[PDB]
Amino acid sequence: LQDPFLNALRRERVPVSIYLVNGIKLQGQIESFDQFVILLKNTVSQMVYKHAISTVVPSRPVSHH
Amino acid sequence: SLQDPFLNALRRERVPVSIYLVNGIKLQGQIESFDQFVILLKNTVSQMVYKHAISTVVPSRPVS
Amino acid sequence: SLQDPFLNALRRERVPVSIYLVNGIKLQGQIESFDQFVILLKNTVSQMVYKHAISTVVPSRPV
Amino acid sequence: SLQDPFLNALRRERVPVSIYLVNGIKLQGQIESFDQFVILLKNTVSQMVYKHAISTVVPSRPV
Amino acid sequence: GQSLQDPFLNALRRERVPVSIYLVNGIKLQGQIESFDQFVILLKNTVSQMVYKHAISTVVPSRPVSH
Amino acid sequence: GQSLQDPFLNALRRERVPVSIYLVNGIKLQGQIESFDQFVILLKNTVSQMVYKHAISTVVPSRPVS
């Protein structure tokens, strides 16, 4: 589920909200991702460790997961 | 496994659930789908929840 | 393997327990079943608790 | 080659200890037994503590 | 090469880009990435400190870094 | 060096440098690194306390260590 879900968000360049395990909310678009991290873009590309992520919430409906 | 049949029952019966995160935050919705690492929870949009950030999955009502 | 016999004892005897999560929050009920990754705790409904989010399992009385 | 000899000495000598959890909570008692994943701590009852939720084990005296 | 993580931290290290590393607690560390392995990142400032990746939420470059 | 963690901790233990170990909850521990293995670090002060690496966020030497 994970690969198809993130790939879709990446392909459609959908604005997303990534919430961390501390409650903090990051926003931007998914540039790329691998087994352990997600590169999130906004002013700069920041590397987010999936282990610190709780949820990835599309800013709008995204068909075909 | 106990996890799969529990989540599969909830998904199949479209039982509204509360998913508590390890930080105490509570998410609500219906389980759309899930794999070994995540659960897609539906409400306005489908959000992807990482199981490693989940503490407990509480059905809103008994599930056979 | 201490886990299995410890949880089995609690389940078998239907001893009320307190499961403290890693955020400090306490859950209570009886252990219905469990596997390598989760424990099904019962009270009003059966709720699925991920062991990775559990800090300690405390029985309400000696077992 | 450290964790086990450290835990065994504590259990063997029944040294009172404080186990700090990652949430800040401090548990106290004597280590009854342990395996690769949990530690059984005794006080009023035996509670099962998950090592993944433990931050530090502080003996109450030099061991 | 095989991950996004290696090339990304290598770029930062190589370019000696000042960075901010946010921990799961919320503390914000800063400095330059001296080195890193499978499990930790050495961050330099007054001293080299060792940060466990499992405690890291994000690594944010202070400026755009290409490639 | 395939591992960075091992030589870093070893230098600290060898030189007996006072360090600060910050835990994931924000709490800070201090003392000297007596020993360590794959999963824990033995920190000394009044007593030897066993710290699980998975609970550690950062190890900060109190001074430069060559």
Curated annotation (Swiss-Prot), chain B:
Domain Sm: 4-63
Molecular functions per Gene Ontology: ATP binding; bent DNA binding; DNA binding; RNA binding; RNA folding chaperone; tRNA binding
Activity regulation annotation text: Forms condensates in vivo, both in the absence and presence of stress, which differ in their material state. Hfq condensation has no impact on transcription but seems important for the roles of Hfq as an mRNA chaperone at the post-transcriptional level. Hfq condensation also appears important for its role as an sRNA stabilizer.
Keyword Metal-binding: no
Single Gene Ontology BP annotation: tRNA processing
Knockout mutant characteristics: Deletion of hfq seems to lead to a significant translational fidelity problem. Deletion increases persister cell formation. Deletion abolishes the antitoxin activity of sRNA antitoxin RalA, preventing it from neutralizing toxin RalR.
Keywords linked to the UniProt accession: Cytoplasm, DNA-binding, RNA-binding, Stress response
Main location: cytoplasm
Compartment list: Cytoplasm
Outcome reported for the amino acid change (mutating residue 4 to A): No effect on Hfq condensate formation in both growing and late stationary phases
A GO cellular component annotation in the UniProt record: bacterial nucleoid
Family recorded in the similarity comment: Belongs to the Hfq family.
Role according to the record: RNA chaperone that binds small regulatory RNA (sRNAs) and mRNAs to facilitate mRNA translational regulation in response to envelope stress, environmental stress and changes in metabolite concentrations. Involved in the regulation of stress responses mediated by the sigma factors RpoS, sigma-E and sigma-32. Binds with high specificity to tRNAs. Binds sRNA antitoxin RalA. In vitro, stimulates synthesis of long tails by poly(A) polymerase I. Required for RNA phage Qbeta replication.
UniProt subunit comment: Homohexamer. Interacts with H-NS.
Record's protein name: RNA-binding protein Hfq
Organism: Escherichia coli (strain K12)
Highest classification ranks of the organism: Bacteria, Pseudomonadati, Pseudomonadota, Gammaproteobacteria, Enterobacterales
Shown residues within the full chain: 6 to 69 of 102
From Swiss-Prot, chains C, D:
Entry keyword annotation includes RNA-binding: yes
Effect of residue 14 to A: Almost completely disrupts the ability of Hfq to form condensates in both growing and late stationary phases
Key words, A-Z: Cytoplasm, DNA-binding, RNA-binding, Stress response
Cellular localisation: Cytoplasm
UniProt GO MF annotations: ATP binding; bent DNA binding; DNA binding; RNA binding; RNA folding chaperone; tRNA binding
Any single biological process term in GO: regulation of RNA stability
Primary role: RNA chaperone that binds small regulatory RNA (sRNAs) and mRNAs to facilitate mRNA translational regulation in response to envelope stress, environmental stress and changes in metabolite concentrations. Involved in the regulation of stress responses mediated by the sigma factors RpoS, sigma-E and sigma-32. Binds with high specificity to tRNAs. Binds sRNA antitoxin RalA. In vitro, stimulates synthesis of long tails by poly(A) polymerase I. Required for RNA phage Qbeta replication.
Family affiliation: Belongs to the Hfq family.
Name of the protein this chain belongs to: RNA-binding protein Hfq
Taxonomic placement: Bacteria, Pseudomonadati, Pseudomonadota, Gammaproteobacteria, Enterobacterales
Gene: hfq
First and last residues shown, out of full length: 6 to 68 of 102
